[PDB]
Amino acid sequence: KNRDMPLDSDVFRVPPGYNAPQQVHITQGDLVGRAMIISWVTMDEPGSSAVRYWSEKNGRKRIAKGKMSTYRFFNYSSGFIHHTTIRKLKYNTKYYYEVGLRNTTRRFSFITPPQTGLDVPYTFGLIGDLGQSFDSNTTLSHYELSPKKGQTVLFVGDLSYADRYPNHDNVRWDTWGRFTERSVAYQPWIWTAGNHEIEFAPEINETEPFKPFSYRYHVPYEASQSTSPFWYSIKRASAHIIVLSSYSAYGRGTPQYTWLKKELRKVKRSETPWLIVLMHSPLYNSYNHHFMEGEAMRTKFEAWFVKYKVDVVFAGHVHAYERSERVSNIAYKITNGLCTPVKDQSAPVYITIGDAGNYGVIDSNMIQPQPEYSAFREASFGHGMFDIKNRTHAHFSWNRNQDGVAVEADSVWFFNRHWYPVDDS
Amino acid sequence: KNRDMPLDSDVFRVPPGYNAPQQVHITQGDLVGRAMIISWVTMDEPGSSAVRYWSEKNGRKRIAKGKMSTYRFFNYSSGFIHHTTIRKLKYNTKYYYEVGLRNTTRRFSFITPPQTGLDVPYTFGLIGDLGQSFDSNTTLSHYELSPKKGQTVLFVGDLSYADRYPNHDNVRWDTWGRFTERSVAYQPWIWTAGNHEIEFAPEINETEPFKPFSYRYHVPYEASQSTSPFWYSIKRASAHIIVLSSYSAYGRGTPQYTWLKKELRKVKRSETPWLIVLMHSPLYNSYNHHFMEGEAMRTKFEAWFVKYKVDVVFAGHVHAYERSERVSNIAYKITNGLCTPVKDQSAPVYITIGDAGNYGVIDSNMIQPQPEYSAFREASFGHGMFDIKNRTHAHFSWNRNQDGVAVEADSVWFFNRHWYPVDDST
Amino acid sequence: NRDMPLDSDVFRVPPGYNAPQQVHITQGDLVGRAMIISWVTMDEPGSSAVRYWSEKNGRKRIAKGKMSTYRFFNYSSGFIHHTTIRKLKYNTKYYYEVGLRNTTRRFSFITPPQTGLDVPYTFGLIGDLGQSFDSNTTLSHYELSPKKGQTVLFVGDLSYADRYPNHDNVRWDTWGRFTERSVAYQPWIWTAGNHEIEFAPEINETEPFKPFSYRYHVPYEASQSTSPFWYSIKRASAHIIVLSSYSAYGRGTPQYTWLKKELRKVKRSETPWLIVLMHSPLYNSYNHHFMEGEAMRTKFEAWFVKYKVDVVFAGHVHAYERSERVSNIAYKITNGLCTPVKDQSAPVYITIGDAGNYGVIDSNMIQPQPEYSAFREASFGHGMFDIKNRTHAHFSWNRNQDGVAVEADSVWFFNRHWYPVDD
Amino acid sequence: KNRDMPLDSDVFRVPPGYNAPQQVHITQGDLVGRAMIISWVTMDEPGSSAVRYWSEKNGRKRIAKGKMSTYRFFNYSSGFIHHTTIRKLKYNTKYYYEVGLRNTTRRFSFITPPQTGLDVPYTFGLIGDLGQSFDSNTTLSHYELSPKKGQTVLFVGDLSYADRYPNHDNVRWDTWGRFTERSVAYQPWIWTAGNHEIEFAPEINETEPFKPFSYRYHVPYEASQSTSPFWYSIKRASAHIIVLSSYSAYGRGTPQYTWLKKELRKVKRSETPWLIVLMHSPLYNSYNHHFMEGEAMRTKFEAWFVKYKVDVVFAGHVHAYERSERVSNIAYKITNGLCTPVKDQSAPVYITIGDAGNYGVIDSNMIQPQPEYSAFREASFGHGMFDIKNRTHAHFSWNRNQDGVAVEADSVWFFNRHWYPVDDST
Ligand SMILES: *[C@@H]1O[C@H](CO)[C@@H](O[C@@H]2O[C@H](CO)[C@@H](O)[C@H](O)[C@H]2NC(C)=O)[C@H](O[C@@H]2O[C@@H](C)[C@@H](O)[C@@H](O)[C@@H]2O)[C@H]1NC(C)=O
Ligand SMILES: *[C@@H]1O[C@H](CO)[C@@H](O[C@@H]2O[C@H](CO)[C@@H](O)[C@H](O)[C@H]2NC(C)=O)[C@H](O[C@@H]2O[C@@H](C)[C@@H](O)[C@@H](O)[C@@H]2O)[C@H]1NC(C)=O
Ligand SMILES: *[C@@H]1O[C@H](CO)[C@@H](O[C@@H]2O[C@H](CO)[C@@H](O)[C@H](O)[C@H]2NC(C)=O)[C@H](O[C@@H]2O[C@@H](C)[C@@H](O)[C@@H](O)[C@@H]2O)[C@H]1NC(C)=O
Ligand SMILES: *[C@@H]1O[C@H](CO)[C@@H](O[C@@H]2O[C@H](CO)[C@@H](O)[C@H](O)[C@H]2NC(C)=O)[C@H](O[C@@H]2O[C@@H](C)[C@@H](O)[C@@H](O)[C@@H]2O)[C@H]1NC(C)=O
Ligand SMILES: *[C@@H]1O[C@H](CO)[C@@H](O[C@@H]2O[C@H](CO)[C@@H](O)[C@H](O)[C@H]2NC(C)=O)[C@H](O[C@@H]2O[C@@H](C)[C@@H](O)[C@@H](O)[C@@H]2O)[C@H]1NC(C)=O
Ligand SMILES: *[C@@H]1O[C@H](CO)[C@@H](O[C@@H]2O[C@H](CO)[C@@H](O)[C@H](O)[C@H]2NC(C)=O)[C@H](O[C@@H]2O[C@@H](C)[C@@H](O)[C@@H](O)[C@@H]2O)[C@H]1NC(C)=O
Ligand SMILES: *[C@@H]1O[C@H](CO)[C@@H](O)[C@H](O[C@@H]2O[C@@H](C)[C@@H](O)[C@@H](O)[C@@H]2O)[C@H]1NC(C)=O
Ligand SMILES: *[C@@H]1O[C@H](CO)[C@@H](O)[C@H](O)[C@H]1NC(C)=O
Ligand SMILES: *[C@@H]1O[C@H](CO)[C@@H](O)[C@H](O)[C@H]1NC(C)=O
Ligand SMILES: *[C@@H]1O[C@H](CO)[C@@H](O)[C@H](O)[C@H]1NC(C)=O
Ligand SMILES: *[C@@H]1O[C@H](CO)[C@@H](O)[C@H](O)[C@H]1NC(C)=O
Ligand SMILES: *[C@@H]1O[C@H](CO)[C@@H](O)[C@H](O)[C@H]1NC(C)=O
Ligand SMILES: *[C@@H]1O[C@H](CO)[C@@H](O)[C@H](O)[C@H]1NC(C)=O
Ligand SMILES: [Fe+3]
Ligand SMILES: [Fe+3]
Ligand SMILES: [Fe+3]
Ligand SMILES: [Fe+3]
Ligand SMILES: [Zn+2]
Ligand SMILES: [Zn+2]
Ligand SMILES: [Zn+2]
Ligand SMILES: [Zn+2]
């Protein structure tokens, strides 16, 4: 049944004025937080890729110059896509920025994160598999209405679900951009590529994976010496965030494998104590839907996560919520019969948070009974919050669409694996 | 430690004459055997990409037109690389072909396979991780001197090992091309991409995986509707051969995953009864080196191989030889504890054959004791032959470098999984 | 102002899902055994395959071509197809179909006879056509001609889309649909004029000839040219040389180099008629664009006389003119030799850029009429160059205001190689 | 006949050190002189495209990041070409810069021109058709030893003459770069494209006009809103310099035509009194060699030069020296018989200065007798100096290779067409 919001919905309204910038969105633009990638689309003509910005502190207006690009997908032709990086921003300060400098100007703002450090607090939103259904809209409202006040969204993939439409009707990317603007124009969303971003459709000569997503959503991948936008790293406040690609190559020797190996080695827990991994497809999942799809990546990387004491791994893909115990399944050797997950205080917690709404369908069927490795699971629409207090403590909470915005249906304290490895079960 | 043949070795000699074609090699150019891709390099000037060819019978000389390309890698600049496809050939006939039409002509020949069919005999050589060491030269000689007489080489990856040299010195691609010539200019080699072809080197700003390899070695990947040179299939005689890429994406919904799922559905066992899979990294491997590297691909494809009753999966990567029992390990569901390989008459035999020589090192360390799923393993240099007799029987043998060219240190009868699914254990 | 409106019948869209539109053809090789088929699909990419067969018997074959797209400012093109059909039979009628996947449309052309000394043929002359009502009239007159044109030599300025805001490239699409009724059935030989340049740095479009060069291909490699803007073809008893007024032609440049070499290749005993096409006239006694042709004239005029070009057709000036056979090639800065003289080795220069443009005629002329000008008139119309045999060609000019059979100006061309009599 | 310096001449020496930058050259990088384009080649590996620079004043060392490129020409493959722009410099300041930051660093310096202004003095060298013959070397020496101290070279085209070699042996581009380094590394040379830069060679599939030149020599063309490296404008001191392309399109409506029309409108003689035009092919020329080749461009632009009262037009192409009277020939209407040049105080002086050496041949055949429009002409090798004193006066001198470096064989004072419009005839 169609639960996608109609094209004439209020959330899809086009900003008025000739060549008004639309689908405005921002993300972190460098490794440590001093830069911001500003992106938007113009529909009437190319327009200018310049961004005007200034801090509240200094009130000196400056100009950053960017780049415009376009793409085609089957018989769709995109508008004019702008990406511009503002650099050398001051930490912990409010900036205003304007786009559409030539015809119709629109102004927004954001706050740069504090400089990275050991005890620096920060609140991350967790959103997965958002889509553009009425549920999607409710989750977005709950997030923006949260008393916890999220400062940056960690997005675990499956953005627009445009690919569910005939020929992937790319108009549905445009609507998604206009819908999400109310949040992502004012705070960065950290992008992870899910399977709905693949858009491999050889039947209509579209054979370059991630094409629409990769034209529309840029990431600071060169900042961490990644050679691809689909895996990369950022540091923000006290968190070191590693973004992975479930649908890229990760065999031994491949670019993603090589990069992750080196990146984990570069992590300094005395500088960013919170080590967080994002990926679309969950390594631990006890739901019927996509059961065991995460197995391949798990066999490659799980031992690295345990060895480097990753604090937490976030994923989506399953349209529900699940939180694992700290467990590992890394003792297997084909013939030794050691294929059962065991408690391991050195392993991350695996959280599945792909329940922001998608196209309005929840994954309710669960493998019964709940396995030992699963601490909490529930088939409900909602979003998460990962609220870092200091180097030892972070509080995670899950909020359900059917609950008040201030209500936590699940919550748990994370004790840091490097600085405070006490049983946080 | 350096057991690579020196640059001035006889196998590396440059063919004489102004702009003489060198590094000549061919491979199947289409889905069923009526085409051939002809490839070669000219060093002095671009030269012609035209190929003259004719059957020894008829003798009507024809011209095929191809394309020239070049590439750079760090401070290396390639010579001029030619790829030309000859099409609409007659089955089971000898053709002569010539390259260097403008200046120094060189002439070679090949024999097209018989048309695909249920009971068409054919002999495949199996060579993996060849490299260019003295051991490499020995393995090649054994293959070309085999009384079995291989008609096509299935190459399971790791070609030149140029990436071991400073800045991957691509000269060592050129030397490997000239060293091969004696063989792959007269019979096709079916290429699989190994980890030594990846050549991911961001430290010298070379970040495109498979670049040198993909410029030098073309495969007929569009013929099987693949969107990439790194996975594809061909039919030859009674065999349907599926080539996979261990070092490309294979997650659910990815191009390779999607392609393979569809491709298996196209397999017709009444026309090609022998279903053969090539990949670089072994799904079953009981050597310590690279132990369990194949697990990721195994979780994705193993159940598929059993479902479609693949006869045999060949791989290289580990520098040794191994032959599994017919087993499967596809019953695991995380908490059911079903994680031990069991005997499964629907499953392929897995053979590791990455011992053609590489840079002169063997992998001798093995998991002890030998696991139940492992039938035979030995750390020696060599190559295999897969000799199809008919729709029910194929004979596989492994020849060691230290033995006479006619000695099989291991040998086994494959009973076809579709036409004759009887226990063929050893 | 005078341009036909978007809802005009001539701009009508062929019905049916992804129906091929803007179909046009042109010679695809050096001597006539090939044809370039071009068209546009708007609904989706579609197939670039062309099905074709000869009326006689007719085994159906398929030729596969290429699809392309482009952007110009805020305009995005449809899916443009170009496909070459090769190895055709001479002097035979062929049918061809495009849009094989969804909506097929069928057309036809007739290949020319093999090239030869005495092979007859009739060429239409059309320049600066545009899409005004005048334009539509000219096209009608040409197609209703009793003399029956078999190929159009087009001397430049096609759609005049560059007159619209941001060169509204939709106006290229309409011109394509407009001209289809003629150019889908017989080749037009394309010359590049100044309205094809489309140099518009103010909207970041700085590649000359961009839209023109995507929509209209020419067989330039067939004569070893390295550019579509200059090339030659042979058809029946004619050798036709197409030059580019708005490309470089300095000594040593590609075009200059190619022309010098191309003239050495002309064989008057295979193709006695040597025809040159260019947009901007070397001889012109109208005020508009007076003397714009001088630069090219100083470079190529002596060559045209040396190789005894029969006739040079140009457009650009929106009127009709025919010169005497004169040359002005003796000037040496200080020697006072700067007047054109009768020269029986020289071509006749014909200005024929009066097919309609955007509805405006150039009527202001230099007075009195110079010696070198034989005939000139400010009327809309088109020409016909009718080759009878190696000695005689008949050229005529038809005015839009006359009956389709009426020739306001008419002249016999006596071949410069086989019959160099004063005409 | 071969008078080109041999490959092992001292002037072609390779700078010592691994990956040592060579063929270093600089030119103005912006409209008004606050920028500089730094160019160099590395032969061993790509290297860094970063330039380190600081003023003799403070400094305050800074880095500018550039770009690397390469090309092939037939069977030639280039080294790694770096172009890096340094911006926001101080006027009238000596700067040091270094290239080759990663392995072998080399250090140079330049002096930024003073801010543009009415009476700003400045000395331009004029060199055309240099080549790499022994004569070429003598001319460069005379320029650098000149008592007048050239501060910037206006170069009227025909650089290396590499195209005279077999397949245009591009190695002769590398030699010419090493030879000219001793001057162009320390002061900008302002490039004009000549016929020897076209390098149209279809017979060897090189069909892109100016390819090697355009890769090796960059100009700040976007600063004057040109859309091509081949025509562009700069201001330097009291001069506004317009560079044109004899071998690009210039018909009505073409990019160069449109650009030049608009550029002349932008000229302000109240800010830059000296209006100078550079082009390769002379509009006025009384030598037999290339007689009247300039006629095509003359017909297009001559009237514009008169209309805007250009002070002086410099050209090369003809291998000799010539200086015209102020003449115009713009009244011709085909039939009216007005086709003789006449004295026109509103017109530029036309100077032919393509006598720096080429491949060792001088053009000595002149049309006799000397025409009225020609003031002075002589067939000797040499170079010119255009020495601006203030808004009204500029001194032009011509120095011959057979004379002392201090001797002026031809000499004339220019009266500025805007600020001192009085007959300056000799
Ligand atoms: C979008 O903004 C442009 C300026 O950033 C407008 O161009 C300008 O229009 C002005 C009218 O107030 C005019 O004086 C300026 O010269 C001109 N500036 C330019 C072209 O750089 C543009 O206005 C439209 O386009 C111009 C060229 C004219 O056609 C106007 O009549 C148009 O309104 C703005 N576009 C629109 C559609 O608003
Ligand atoms: C790091 O953050 C923790 C979570 O906010 C701090 O714990 C909290 O400390 C409060 C007193 O400052 C106390 O009222 C709260 O109950 C407590 N929260 C929890 C969930 O335990 C933590 O404070 C230290 O450790 C706690 C357990 C107490 O021992 C405090 O006295 C300590 O200050 C913060 N650590 C530091 C070094 O501040
Ligand atoms: C396929 O090839 C096999 C090996 O060439 C055939 O088996 C062999 O038959 C020989 C006489 O033809 C016999 O002496 C060999 O012992 C035997 N070889 C082996 C390894 O079994 C096979 O022939 C059929 O099946 C075998 C088991 C016997 O029953 C034969 O009599 C059969 O013809 C060949 N199969 C077919 C269908 O051609
Ligand atoms: C791109 O191709 C689509 C078909 O593959 C177009 O949709 C089809 O339009 C048909 C009428 O031409 C209509 O009957 C079909 O229902 C429809 N097919 C599907 C699967 O939706 C699409 O057309 C645009 O949108 C449709 C719904 C109509 O409004 C058309 O008039 C529109 O052009 C094509 N899109 C574009 C931008 O061309
Ligand atoms: C080429 O075609 C010309 C035009 O038809 C021929 O001239 C015409 O010949 C007619 C006899 O068939 C004659 O009545 C006409 O007067 C004449 N038309 C013109 C415009 O002159 C021409 O015939 C040759 O040359 C002319 C001058 C006469 O000498 C004829 O007798 C000749 O046959 C044709 N030339 C050739 C080579 O056939
Ligand atoms: C502009 O530069 C001219 C060339 O240098 C100056 O002329 C020269 O002035 C010298 C002393 O200043 C004098 O000895 C030279 O003969 C003379 N050179 C020439 C070629 O005339 C010029 O100076 C002005 O005009 C000259 C003729 C003298 O009358 C000076 O006294 C004047 O100042 C310079 N103009 C200015 C305003 O400085
Ligand atoms: C155009 O031709 C192609 C190829 O023959 C057809 O597949 C199209 O059919 C349409 O799209 C397919 C995928 C299927 O949905 C069918 O029912 C549709 O009719 C055809 N396109 C149209 C619009 O006719
Ligand atoms: C392009 O721009 C013009 C305004 O300059 C606008 O009026 C026109 O409709 C636009 N065309 C498009 C967006 O296709
Ligand atoms: C989406 O949510 C916003 C904020 O709650 C609300 O104002 C708007 O009406 C909603 N739109 C739809 C279509 O649900
Ligand atoms: C390689 O083997 C070949 C064939 O046996 C032999 O001719 C040659 O000498 C060998 N070359 C080297 C370097 O071993
Ligand atoms: C290029 O070709 C010429 C012959 O055409 C040859 O003599 C020369 O050595 C070659 N140069 C290189 C480096 O290939
Ligand atoms: C154009 O000309 C054709 C042919 O005479 C005629 O049928 C058509 O109606 C005309 N259209 C317009 C709008 O002039
Ligand atoms: C070039 O001139 C310089 C300076 O006069 C001199 O030192 C050098 O030897 C000359 N080189 C030649 C003539 O090859
Ligand atoms: Fe999802
Ligand atoms: Fe190996
Ligand atoms: Fe016109
Ligand atoms: Fe010269
Ligand atoms: Zn998903
Ligand atoms: Zn390997
Ligand atoms: Zn015109
Ligand atoms: Zn010259």
Coordinates of N, CA and C in Angstrom, one line a residue, chain C residues 42 326 409:
Chain C
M42 N 12.3 12.0 -27.5 CA 12.1 12.9 -26.4 C 11.7 12.1 -25.1
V326 N 35.3 37.1 -62.5 CA 36.3 38.1 -62.3 C 37.3 37.6 -61.2
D409 N 15.8 34.7 -62.4 CA 17.2 34.8 -63.0 C 17.6 33.4 -63.5

